[PDB]
Amino acid sequence: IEEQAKTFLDKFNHEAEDLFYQSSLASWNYNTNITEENVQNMNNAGDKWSAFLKEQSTLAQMYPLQEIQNLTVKLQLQALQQNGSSVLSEDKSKRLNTILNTMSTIYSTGKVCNPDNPQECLLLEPGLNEIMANSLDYNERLWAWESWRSEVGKQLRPLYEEYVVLKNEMARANHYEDYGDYWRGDYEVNGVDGYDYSRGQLIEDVEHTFEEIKPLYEHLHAYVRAKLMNAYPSYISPIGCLPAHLLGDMWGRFWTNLYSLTVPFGQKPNIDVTDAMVDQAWDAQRIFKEAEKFFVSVGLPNMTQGFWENSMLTDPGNVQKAVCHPTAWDLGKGDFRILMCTKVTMDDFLTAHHEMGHIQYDMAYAAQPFLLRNGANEGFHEAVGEIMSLSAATPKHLKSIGLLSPDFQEDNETEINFLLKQALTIVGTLPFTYMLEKWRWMVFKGEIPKDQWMKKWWEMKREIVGVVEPVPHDETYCDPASLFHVSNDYSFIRYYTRTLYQFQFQEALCQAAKHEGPLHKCDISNSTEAGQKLFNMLRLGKSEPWTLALENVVGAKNMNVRPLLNYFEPLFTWLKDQNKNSFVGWSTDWSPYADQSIKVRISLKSALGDKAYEWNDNEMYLFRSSVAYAMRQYFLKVKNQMILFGEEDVRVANLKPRISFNFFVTAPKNVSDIIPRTEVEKAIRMSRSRINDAFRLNDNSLEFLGIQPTL
Partner 1 sequence: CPFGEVFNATRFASVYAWNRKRISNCVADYSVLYNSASFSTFKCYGVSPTKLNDLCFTNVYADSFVIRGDEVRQIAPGQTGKIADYNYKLPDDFTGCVIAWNSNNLDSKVGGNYNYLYRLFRKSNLKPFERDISTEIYQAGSTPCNGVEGFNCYFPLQSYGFQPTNGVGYQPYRVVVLSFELL
Provide the annotated binding site for substrate: 253, 325-326, 495
Please check whether residue 497 is in contact with residue 378, taking contact to mean a CB–CB distance below 8 angstroms: yes
Q: CB within 8 A of 374, min separation 6: which ones?
A: 541, 542
Burial status of residue 581 (CB atoms within 10 A of its CB: 0-12, 13-18, 19 or more): exposed
Please check whether residue 366 is in contact with residue 304, taking contact to mean a CB–CB distance below 8 angstroms: no
Kindly tell me the sign of the dihedral angle through the C-alpha atoms of 109, 114, 115, 118: negative
CB of 75 to partner 1, least distance (A): 22
Task: Write out the binding residues for Zn(2+).
Answer: 354, 358, 382
The residues carrying an active-site annotation are: 355, 485
User: Nearer Cβ to its own copies, position 199 or 696?
Assistant: 696
Q: How many CA atoms lie within 13 A of 85 on its CB side?
A: 12
**Strands laid side by side in the 650-653 sheet:** 650-653, 660-665, 598-602, 702-705
Q: CB within 8 A of 415, min separation 6: which ones?
A: 570
**Pairwise CA distance, residues 197 & 463, whole Å:** 30
Please check whether residue 168 is in contact with residue 440, taking contact to mean a CB–CB distance below 8 angstroms: no
Nearest to 381 by CA among 358, 410, 365, 355: 358
CB of 616 to its own copies, least distance (A): 8
| The residue type at 283 | D
| Inter-axis angle of helices 569-578 and 412-426, nearest 10 | 100
Length of the chain: 711
Among partner 1, its own copies, none, partner that 62 touches (CB below 5 to 8 angstroms by kind):
partner 1
Cα radius of gyration rounded to whole Å, the chain: 30
**Pairwise CA distance, residues 220 & 465, whole Å:** 12
User: Nearer Cβ to its own copies, position 118 or 706?
Assistant: 118
User: Nearer Cβ to its own copies, position 66 or 618?
Assistant: 618
Among its own copies, partner 1, none, partner that 333 touches (CB below 5 to 8 angstroms by kind):
partner 1
Degrees, nearest 5: CA angle 641-646-647: 150
CB of 625 to its own copies, least distance (A): 4
Which residues lie near partner 1 (CB under 8 A)?
1, 3-4, 7, 10-11, 14, 18, 21, 62, 304-306, 310, 333-335
CB of 333 to partner 1, least distance (A): 5
| The residue type at 636 | L
User: Nearer Cβ to partner 1, position 215 or 301?
Assistant: 301
Among its own copies, partner 1, none, partner that 10 touches (CB below 5 to 8 angstroms by kind):
partner 1
Residue 113 forms beta bridges with which residues? 121
Among partner 1, its own copies, none, partner that 109 touches (CB below 5 to 8 angstroms by kind):
its own copies
Among its own copies, partner 1, none, partner that 492 touches (CB below 5 to 8 angstroms by kind):
none
Nearest to 153 by CA among 580, 485, 545, 479: 479
> Which letter does DSSP use for residue 604 in this model?
-
In sequence order, what E strands does 320-411 have? 327-330, 336-339
Task: Give CA torsion, residues 474, 478, 482, 483, to 10 deg.
Answer: 110
Please check whether residue 29 is in contact with residue 41, taking contact to mean a CB–CB distance below 8 angstroms: yes
Please check whether residue 149 is in contact with residue 479, taking contact to mean a CB–CB distance below 8 angstroms: yes
Which residues lie near its own copies (CB under 8 A)?
105-106, 109-111, 118-119, 155, 616, 618, 621-622, 625-626, 629, 632-633, 636, 647, 690, 693-694, 696
Among its own copies, partner 1, none, partner that 693 touches (CB below 5 to 8 angstroms by kind):
its own copies
CB of 126 to its own copies, least distance (A): 17
Task: Write out the binding residues.
Answer: 149, 253, 325-326, 354, 358, 382, 457, 461, 495
**Pairwise CA distance, residues 315 & 168, whole Å:** 45
Q: CB within 8 A of 22, min separation 6: which ones?
A: 45, 48
Q: CB within 8 A of 29, min separation 6: which ones?
A: 38, 41, 42
> Which letter does DSSP use for residue 349 in this model?
H
User: Nearer Cβ to its own copies, position 247 or 697?
Assistant: 697
User: Nearer Cβ to its own copies, position 113 or 556?
Assistant: 113
User: Nearer Cβ to partner 1, position 11 or 576?
Assistant: 11
CB atoms within 10 A of CB 708: 7
Among its own copies, partner 1, none, partner that 11 touches (CB below 5 to 8 angstroms by kind):
partner 1
Burial status of residue 607 (CB atoms within 10 A of its CB: 0-12, 13-18, 19 or more): middle
Please check whether residue 487 is in contact with residue 155, taking contact to mean a CB–CB distance below 8 angstroms: no
Q: CB within 8 A of 703, min separation 6: which ones?
A: 600, 601, 602
- In this structure, what are the phi and psi dihedrals at residue 324, rounded to the nearest 5 degrees? -125, 95
Degrees, nearest 5: CA angle 394-397-401: 140
User: Nearer Cβ to partner 1, position 12 or 143?
Assistant: 12
